[PDB]
Symmetry: D2
Subunit: 429 residues, 4 copies
């Protein structure tokens, strides 16, 4: 059993009682969650997609938290060698590990209306991560995209980040590979071209997806949200602008969850730019997704977004010119620049979902509905098959007792399976 | 109703719910504590010694906490004009106000097997949250204790000591008051400039019951509000790697008796904490009476823990600078932390809060029959009660209405404690 | 005539008399040199290679130096729009302009043994540019390569820089496009992966080549050396390691000029790593260049370099493990980390050369010679055809009065024109 | 032969050729200047007033400049022990030594149509090379002049003034000596700490002829060596946006007469440079004699350029802080620079170096027939000669061997100059 001991980057101190919460036992669940999250960080740049196999490869790996003279040390037992560069752990992965130690301890010490308490946990987690700060102008634009993406979609996703970084704007993704790291490498060379001295590449993951989508090495501010819904909520609240790239089913869910918030009449005065961008060959891909949400949510969905094709400079130029309007709107409310408190996320979009055939059953998918409740629970169906696609329980539940094809309707069921078939075509998992 | 808005320096954001906790309201009692602590901050340099006298003038003073575009923002209503220079607040007081806001919110949010373990962990948490547990390449934090009402000779000597301490790149922690709580910081500020020392840390530690009597001096750059008297005493011993005690009153005696009670515990026999008592030429008679009192009550094995250096500021600073490598190795050889002494054992009786009543003071076990830990703990309480009955409303009210305190003990021990406390009055330290 | 006024990034102050040296006249040569160097900086990322045309496109462009309350302002008349991003000049180009203002004023105020004075001018220029500083360990590796290079050579040149930046090493090129900027973008994302907070991407150009090879935007420390020979000397003295990529004739000259310094017996104890690296398809290209300098300089040339193919991590890993040996050797001499004083550059390699048929005539190219004098003047032949290829006088002199094919010998003349024909094959200019 | 090596803080590399210029050698005369300036740096705080007395003790002291792996490195041989604390040099003196090395090399390297233009450009170049021409959002550099030998009352008042100046985020430039050249810096260091002012700039300006008589105080964080007396005087007026003059001796009078000669030039009628003369209560009789002297020789139109504030440190600092926005707009409306006043016209006669000889002092045009510019320039020379004949070897030698200086002038003007200079002696300022 070969070990390695990692130092803190910023002075970090624990008590003998906080470390004991992480002490290795077979009865305390909390170590396991801390152990696997640490393992996922160490498999950054994973050459695979499956999440069941990565744990089965590093089983003798473990982690001990230590209290030394200068603070906390992470004693890593049998760490993956691909995390090292010449016998030393890549310092981004070191910072990610201590971010995992920071968030896990916080989200569990705080546990020990109801919608106000949830958004505040999101606010308190980002604040404790020191991830809530604005410069002279808000510049945080989050980017959504798939994991297994094209070679041209990657280059296009790098060109957009470079033109975004050239205009001094920061990126926030779900810290995954593919379209979730390509804009960061572009922005890394973009900030270098304009001498932007303080880049913030925020990766926001959560335990149940971190093993399938390992945090890419370009992330410099990683935050662990408790579950899927709070990570989605953190996205739109820390955001000043959104750009969406072609992606698998996980990207579809993100688009609806958000679209279920701008279409709420309680958010008619909120400003939030959204551009769906893609390379030359994503023209057909985008038309089939527009024809989706224009058949699901009506033609109202096109008043809140614009689609641009084969252009990196325009979507960055238009995203930059939106920050003054974003800034101005935060002041009229009296809101904050670094956190959108005023936007109303309905309690039906904050509620969690554990994917089962049983619960995938009674999904309300009729176009009858208020635009909100349809997309609110339609995105649950996408959350269900990402679990069936990537994560241990959804894969297993879909393995043993069958697949999910549960609720039909007019075009939308024509369109639902139009998409996943139009998704498997380009191998989007 | 004159209004002044003061934003802050870092990233400080509050929810609407934490701001609601501090509104002048009948829903939670944080406002009267947060407003009184804020008013004491703005009375820096005030020649006042009582608490009621501070609140008596500024009656129309209030403070709101606003949530705006770039985070928290404090709105002060008729603040003391002495807090201004050329129409702008002194920046030290502005940062102190945001430290009051930080410490009041965190403590009350954290309140909501042993209790001794949890008290020490609370102390550590407040310091951790205040970004106060920082250590360079070597431990260099030197706690200085002294009187709020001192001579100009003692003030100059204390500033000369702090100047020598600053020349050796040592930092200063203090009870943040005036007098000998301010002089070493003024000296270290010049000393650090002479050695071009960049990141000076002048930690002030106060608590709600004393902050109005001894408002934080403007030389403090790191204010910490501990929840009460006992946990601020604990804070001193934990952050310190060396302690210096100038001449002072009962507040200085309380801190002295507290520290001796810890050092004389056999569980701390392997603990390195250099303790130097120092003063100018005239303080020789002072330290002789003080030493004789400690040496009688606690035994002649008390001088094992302190040294008395008189009229030598360079030697005081030289001795503690030489002692820091010893502290570093002591922490190293026990897995302990450089910036927070976990290994030091504080008996629960030293952590137990004490309310000065006429009956509690009369039932202190000041007799030679008791062990030294019981003696030092109860002597701490006795002095703590004299502090309250002198500068705090709950003590002044109870004394001015039921009579002065009457402590009971051995007729020789109290004969010496009396003799000393009258020197305190004679040198214009307390009454 | 539309203008724009640029601010200094670091407080820069001139006197009324230093600016008058730059005052616009038709008789003072010095403004022209300052004007065109400023123009070349503004054409960063040029889509062309020719240097005669770029001046002919921006003739109404001019520059005035101003003395204002907070120091120097650059008043740019009719600047190229491609230098701007949304109506504001890219800040790297701003820093490059003030570096041009800094160096030009210095190299001309200092003018107003002989080999010791030359190296000291090089030292004083780098020192005045604040470009001579070393961290705990020397980490400056310079990279040489062509301008018009492959798409695979660019990606490979980006992979090497990323693995170089992953090991916390800095880059120094001649600030050109192609293989001279690809390692910088790789190192930009490499330093971001290891949280290297202070990258130094040193571009070193000189007046007579800056217009054909515009300073790429990835340069953060640009220095203008007076001529071709001093820029070559600055390279090997500020260097702790060298890596050479496939390139045109300009890259050949750099390889020999250097190789004429390690083969000097006075430099037998000097350590300086050199790796010639290239992608999969540069295997034949490298064998024809080895068979060149092994037929020109003997088999002695292979004791000072090693050739690795289709590997970015090894040449970075071996370049990193060389820094302790580089460091150790600088101490045994009592030399400096940031400037190699001890290395002896023969006066025959410091002497300038103005390319003419007349002076390309009496080149001594017999393999008779001491290894030093052959390569010393053999690299002049390469300096002559780069001038014939890219720069106004060499192009013109070759235009009006014929090409240069002047001195023959055994294999080496077989090998000389073996190369330029083996260079035009892949369009290396 | 005790040896101590001191590396430096920034990136300072020298060629073998610049190091050869400073070797104890018969090839260039930089060594005796560089060694004497270094020895004066290491004698910070020395109670010595003459130059020969500084060099007399440390006779075996020398200094070499080594070129090593990470740049320049200074090797000092038997340096003054007073420069050490706990066996290490004070960091301010170490940085001063590297400023001496920087200024001696640059000046001598720059030496190798009008001459007035080139003198001003040299002054600007030395400041530019020393990274001393920096301006924040507002001009805040306040030049303070005062005596090297002052009262404790005057020292406290000057420190109280500097404390008030530091509370308004104003920086201090000084002739780097002791006394009133040190007190405002000690005060500003505490003042800057109270306002949490981060980047304090305490510029000390000295020159080879005076540095041994008034060694740089340890509170200076930016030492500048100007080549001689006249160019250091020029440096003061150019970097300053305000000037404060405490009581002093002939050196303070020389600086006063120099500045008045510039302000009274009609070419400077549109120049904003606030000038305040200030002192404690007892200095009232001092400033009355001083004001009467200036007001007689230069005319009653001299008070147009200065104000006398007595026993009010807050008002002095308040007046100059209010004056900085005026200075900023003055520079703005003329295209001039914030950190270096190019527009100020210094007559060549004020730039002309003066060697004090018995004949030059006897042929000064101190008569009311001459214009005020000739009067102020020659009065500057007269006082400059008394400085040399008091604390400098070339003056002390010529006086102790040929007799004291005899200045000639109007029998009323010299009657007042005599009367004043005897007050200087009576208050123990010069002899």
């Amino acid at each position: 059993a070969i070990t390695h001991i990692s130092p803190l980057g910023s002075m970090d101190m624990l008590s003998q009682l906080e470390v004991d919460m992480l002490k290795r036992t077979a009865s305390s669940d909390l170590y396991q969650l801390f152990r696997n999250c640490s393992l996922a960080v160490l498999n950054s740049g994973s050459l695979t997609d499956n999440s069941k196999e990565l744990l089965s490869r590093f089983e003798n790996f473990d982690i001990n938290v230590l209290r030394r003279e200068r603070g906390v040390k992470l004693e890593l037992i049998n760490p993956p060698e691909e995390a090292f560069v010449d016998g030393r752990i890549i310092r981004a992965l070191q910072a990610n590990l201590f971010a995992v130690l920071r968030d896990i301890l916080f989200v569990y010490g705080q546990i020990h209306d109801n919608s106000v308490h949830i958004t505040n946990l999101v606010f308190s987690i980002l604040r404790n991560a020191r991830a809530l700060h604005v410069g002279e102008a808000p510049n945080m634009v989050v980017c959504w995209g798939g994991h297994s993406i094209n070679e041209n979609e990657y280059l296009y996703a790098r060109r957009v980040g470079n033109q975004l970084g050239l205009r001094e704007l920061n990126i926030c993704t779900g810290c995954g590979p593919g379209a979730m790291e390509a804009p960061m490498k572009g922005a890394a060379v973009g900030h270098a071209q304009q001498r932007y001295k303080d880049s913030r590449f925020i990766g926001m993951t959560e335990p149940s997806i971190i093993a399938a989508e390992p945090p890419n090495p370009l992330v410099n501010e990683l935050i662990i949200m408790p579950d899927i819904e709070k990570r989605l909520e953190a996205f739109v609240r820390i955001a000043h602008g959104i750009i969406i790239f072609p992606g698998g089913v996980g990207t579809a869910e993100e688009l609806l969850y958000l679209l279920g918030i701008l279409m709420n009449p309680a958010n008619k005065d909120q400003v939030l730019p959204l551009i769906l961008t893609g390379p030359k060959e994503s023209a057909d891909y985008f038309r089939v997704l527009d024809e989706f949400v224009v058949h699901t949510l009506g033609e109202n969905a096109r008043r809140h977004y614009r689609i641009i094709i084969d252009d990196a400079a325009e979507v960055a130029r238009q995203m930059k010119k939106s920050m003054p309007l974003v800034k101005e709107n935060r002041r009229d409310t009296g809101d904050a620049y670094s956190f959108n408190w005023s936007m109303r996320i309905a309690p039906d979009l904050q509620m969690p979902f554990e994917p089962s055939h049983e619960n995938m059953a009674n999904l309300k998918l009729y176009p009858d509905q208020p635009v909100e409740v349809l997309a609110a629970d339609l995105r649950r169906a996408f959350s269900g098959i990402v679990a069936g696609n990537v994560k241990e329980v959804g894969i297993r539940a879909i393995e043993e007792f069958g697949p999910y094809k549960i609720n039909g309707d007019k075009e939308i069921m024509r369109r639902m399976d139009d998409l996943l078939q139009g998704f498997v075509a380009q191998h989007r998992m």
